[PDB]
Amino acid sequence: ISYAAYLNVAAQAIRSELQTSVLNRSQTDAFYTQYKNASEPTPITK
Amino acid sequence: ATLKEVEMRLKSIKNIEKITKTMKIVASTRLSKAEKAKISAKKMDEAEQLFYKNAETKNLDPKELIVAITSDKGLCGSIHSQLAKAVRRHLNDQPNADIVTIGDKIKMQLLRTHPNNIKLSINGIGKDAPTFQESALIADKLLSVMKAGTYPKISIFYNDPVSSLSFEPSEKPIFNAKTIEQSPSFGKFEIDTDANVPRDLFEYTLANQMLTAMAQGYAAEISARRNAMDNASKNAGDMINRYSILYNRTRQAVITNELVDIITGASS
Amino acid sequence: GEWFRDNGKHALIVYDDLSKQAVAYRQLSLLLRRPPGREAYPGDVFYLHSRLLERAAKLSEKEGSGSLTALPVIETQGGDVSAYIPTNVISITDGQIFLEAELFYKGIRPAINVGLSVSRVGSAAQVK
Numbered sequence: 001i002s003y004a005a006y007l008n009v010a011a012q013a014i015r016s017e018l019q020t021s022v023l024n025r026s027q028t029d030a031f032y033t034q035y036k037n038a039s040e041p042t043p044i045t046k
Numbered sequence: 047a048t049l050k051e052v053e054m055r056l057k058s059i060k061n062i063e064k065i066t067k068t069m070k071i072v073a074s075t076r077l078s079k080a081e082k083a084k085i086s087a088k089k090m091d092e093a094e095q096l097f098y099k100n101a102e103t104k105n106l107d108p109k110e111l112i113v114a115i116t117s118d119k120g121l122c123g124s125i126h127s128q129l130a131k132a133v134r135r136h137l138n139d140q141p142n143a144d145i146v147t148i149g150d151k152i153k154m155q156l157l158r159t160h161p162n163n164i165k166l167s168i169n170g171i172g173k174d175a176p177t178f179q180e181s182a183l184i185a186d187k188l189l190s191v192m193k194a195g196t197y198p199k200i201s202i203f204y205n206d207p208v209s210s211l212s213f214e215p216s217e218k219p220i221f222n223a224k225t226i227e228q229s230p231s232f233g234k235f236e237i238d239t240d241a242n243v244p245r246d247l248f249e250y251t252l253a254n255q256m257l258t259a260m261a262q263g264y265a266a267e268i269s270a271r272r273n274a275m276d277n278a279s280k281n282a283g284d285m286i287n288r289y290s291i292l293y294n295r296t297r298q299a300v301i302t303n304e305l306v307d308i309i310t311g312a313s314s
Numbered sequence: 315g316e317w318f319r320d321n322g323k324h325a326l327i328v329y330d331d332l333s334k335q336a337v338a339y340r341q342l343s344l345l346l347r348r349p350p351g352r353e354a355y356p357g358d359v360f361y362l363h364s365r366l367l368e369r370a371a372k373l374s375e376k377e378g379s380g381s382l383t384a385l386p387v388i389e390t391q392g393g394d395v396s397a398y399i400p401t402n403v404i405s406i407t408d409g410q411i412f413l414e415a416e417l418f419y420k421g422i423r424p425a426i427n428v429g430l431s432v433s434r435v436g437s438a439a440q441v442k
Binding site: 028 | 183
């Protein structure tokens with residue numbers, strides 16, 4: 001858990017009809033993938 | 047030469063002419079969000095860096111974390127070209143470093159020049175305008191799986207839109223918990239020595255400075271994609287019309303040659 | 315090559331170049347004043363290569379299992395298989411090895427195009 005996470009949660013709460021852009025920042029598609037000497041472990045989502 | 051090959055070749059270029067022009071509009075109509083999120087980020091950037099200025103924070107006196115900021119989408123120009131060189135060229139001085147790459151089209155040049163340096167890569171991000179949640183999560187992994195807090199120096203590489211027709215590879219520093227409280231003019235600000243403020247300040251400036259870098263990074267890109275595809279639709283013009291003439295030069299020659307055999311075989 | 319086929323032996327005949335044979339036959343017909351067909355070629359230009367290639371075959375066991383393998387060679391202009399003569403011979407042979415000039419200079423030799431080349435006989439006459 002990170003401090004940026006302690007803030008992310010709150011930013012999701014303020015999604016509470018006329019919420020235009022606003023919906024583009026509500027979610028995102030992210031896939032991180034480690035790497036080795038290049039080789040790379042299994043790609044998971046955020 | 048073929049009756050048809052010059053027609054279906056004219057088709058795979060006639061529709062390529064509109065497609066590059068249809069994405070030029072997408073990039074040109076999306077420049078509005080680009081020129082806004084750019085100013086919003088920068089304004090928060092000033093608000094965020096003013097503390098780092100009045101506190102006179104600077105890197106301590108061989109690890110360093112490098113973050114590459116670009117997209118996975120091509121058709122944008124030399125934005126993935128010049129930025130990757132700026133990184134490589136900065137990497138030459140200090141080979142001792144780990145590189146986290148955001149976007150795959152930046153992972154390209156780095157896999158070639160310095161394949162082992164890449165210890166982490168983010169996939170499928172550069173398509174929309176960046177968001178805090180996106181960056182805050184990238185920093186959360188950067189902090190966890192990479193342990194950025196154990197690094198003496200952080201460097202974010204991004205693209206800065208100097209002009210609306212040209213971009214500019216740039217670099218910004220991120221200072222860790224230890225570098226913040228050990229700042230010369232850090233006592234200048236009253237801070238309770240218990241609520242781990244310096245620690246929370248780094249984990250928070252890690253996400254923001256990324257978004258600020260992304261905002262300008264994906265803004266300089268959209269501004270470069272419009273340019274990249276305005277030259278494309280124009281270049282598709284010297285094709286749709288060039289081969290257009292060649293189609294007719296073939297159509298007239300088809301009707302004549304098709305008619306000669308008839309007249310020749312009618313004389314008997 | 316038929317003598318070998320007729321006598322339990324195996325002959326392999328290569329026609330090169332066939333495109334030039336038709337060229338010649340067009341000369342005969344046009345000077346004899348026989349009406350021209352497509353591309354000036356005589357009307358029975360398909361029959362010209364049909365009766366020729368069919369002669370190449372594998373006889374039965376009662377006849378001596380003698381065979382005759384034909385490897386016709388045709389020349390195309392501008393890589394246009396859609397031409398008249400090329401199409402004729404194509405519909406005759408039980409196969410086709412199409413050599414492209416682009417693949418030739420690019421390194422692949424022989425410049426066989428896997429996509430356009432096929433052998434209707436297939437594994438039937440291949441090493442197990």
